[PDB]
Amino acid sequence: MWELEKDVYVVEVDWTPDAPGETVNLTCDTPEEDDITWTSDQRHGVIGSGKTLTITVKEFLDAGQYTCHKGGETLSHSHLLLHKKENGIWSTEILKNFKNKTFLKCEAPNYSGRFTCSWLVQRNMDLKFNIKSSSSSPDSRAVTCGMASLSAEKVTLDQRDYEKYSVSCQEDVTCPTAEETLPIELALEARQQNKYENYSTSFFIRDIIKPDPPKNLQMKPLKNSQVEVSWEYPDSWSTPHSYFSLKFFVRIQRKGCNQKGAFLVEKTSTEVQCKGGNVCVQAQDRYYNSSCSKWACVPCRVR
């Protein structure tokens, strides 16, 4: 086994039923060496006596909070977790994958080094989430990640509505304009009732840029039939715009980048003659095939 934190350990178990479990020592962190007994949460009563308790673990019933006992008082506790491994493959049962089979969707609204990663859960009961840089060595990328959180947005797939947890992360060393030489390698420690699973992902910020919708969309009726649609760069997006230039796509509708026909405009305004419908605009990084922003739309209504 291997330690995760104070009084918390993780047992690598081969789940194939023909293979035997792993025997593990649990020693009580106390000066005493007589009158030492153990009580598990999974099993009522005492299971073993002596300072060092050696137990075989193959099922979740052999996990949990093992707590010592002497003279009727608790001495020290130790919590165990299981990491399933079937045919030499680590379990991925806590999280729900996306259509693309990945578990960690990460997106960045600018080159500021800040980004956010989201994931889907199979169930929402007694979950603990931690995320940290998976390399943590010279020639790596220092990233500080805040706490995870449930997003109001539920994500629906083939029929089932899965819940989504997101987390905000910030890179420490940041020169926005610098070309990315080495990818950000992240890892997610996911824990449920006693099951331990971790996920990995390596990405460049440049490859996960998704700008925000253009701001202050204006629809100024100019000519009897024509209207000037205007907008501005999103306040979120990186400055200076002279370097971080977004190109925009204009569309007309009758009430990832999805391109079903649109006229390209790199300026922040365009005249259009629609006479009914809705004018919509999405933004994209000009010099890179980054994901496009969500459409911002105005109704076509002329004087």
Ligand X SMILES: *[C@@H]1O[C@H](CO)[C@@H](O[C@@H]2O[C@H](CO)[C@@H](O[C@@H]3O[C@H](CO)[C@@H](O)[C@H](O[C@H]4O[C@H](CO)[C@@H](O)[C@H](O)[C@@H]4O)[C@@H]3O)[C@H](O)[C@H]2NC(C)=O)[C@H](O)[C@H]1NC(C)=O
Which residues make up the interface to ligand X (CB under 6 A)? 2-3, 10, 12, 83, 134, 187, 189, 198, 200
Work out what residue 64 binds among ligand X, Cl ion, a second copy, none; the CB cut-off runs from 5 to 8 Å by kind. Answer: none
Work out what residue 212 binds among ligand X, a second copy, Cl ion, none; the CB cut-off runs from 5 to 8 Å by kind. Answer: none
According to DSSP, the residues that pair with 171 across neighbouring strands are: 143
* Least distance from Cl ion to the Cβ atom of residue 187, Å: 13
User: Does the protein bind a second copy through residue 181 (CB under 8 A)?
Assistant: no
CB 203 within 8 A of CB 106: yes
Please give the DSSP secondary-structure letter assigned to residue 222: -
d(CA 4, CA 185): 20
Work out what residue 245 binds among Cl ion, a second copy, ligand X, none; the CB cut-off runs from 5 to 8 Å by kind. Answer: a second copy
Work out what residue 296 binds among Cl ion, ligand X, a second copy, none; the CB cut-off runs from 5 to 8 Å by kind. Answer: none
CB 283 within 8 A of CB 270: no
* Least distance from a second copy to the Cβ atom of residue 171, Å: 12
Write phi, then psi, for 132 (nearest 5 degrees): -155, 160
User: Does the protein bind a second copy through residue 287 (CB under 8 A)?
Assistant: yes
* Residues 12, 17, 18, 22, CA torsion sign: positive
Return the residues of window 223-262 that contact a second copy according to CB under 8 A.
239-240, 242-243, 245
User: Does the protein bind a second copy through residue 288 (CB under 8 A)?
Assistant: no
Query: Which 3 state secondary structure label does DSSP give 186?
Result: strand
* Least distance from ligand X to the Cβ atom of residue 134, Å: 5
3-state helix, strand, coil in the chain (%, to 5): 0, 50, 50
- Strand 89-90 relative to strand 77-86, pairing: antiparallel
Query: Which 3 state secondary structure label does DSSP give 205?
Result: helix
Return the residues of window 199-228 that contact Cl ion according to CB under 5 A.
203
Contact footprint for Cl ion (CB under 5 A): 106, 203
Contact footprint for a second copy (CB under 8 A): 173-178, 239-240, 242-243, 245, 287
